[PDB]
Amino acid sequence: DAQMRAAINQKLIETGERERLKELLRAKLIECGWKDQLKAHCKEVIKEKGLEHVTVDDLVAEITPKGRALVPDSVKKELLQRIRTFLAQHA
């Protein structure tokens, strides 16, 4: 049910938990080199398409699929655990 999801999301937000998890997620992605991989891929797409042609929308479209696939399953496992811990303590 979506109404439940809306209720939880609102809680994550007002409790500041969402902002906190977001910060730690970003920090872990930076730490493991995930962001450096994005930048490396951008450099190649720029060199391939050319600055006279490429836009930000082009880069995102080209880089996203690989980016999504390179998010480590370890951080996804830890995130899920944080969410469950959060639900258990607020419900």
């Binding site: 998890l21 996804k76 899920l80």
Partner: protein
Amino acid sequence: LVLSELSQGLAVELMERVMMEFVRETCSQELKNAVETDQRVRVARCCEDVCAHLVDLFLVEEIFQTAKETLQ
């Protein structure tokens, strides 16, 4: 015993939103840097063309004035 896949869905959505925003910010910054660098390249390059143009112009004139002075 996980009853519902509600928590799974929340972790997947949250991860996807954070990830997506990070890609957008990264691509925007990388392209901004590249365009800034290229701008410096183009300014330098154009300065070279202008310099070469001015020299050849002033020169074509000085080659005429020199020729004159030698005659007679």
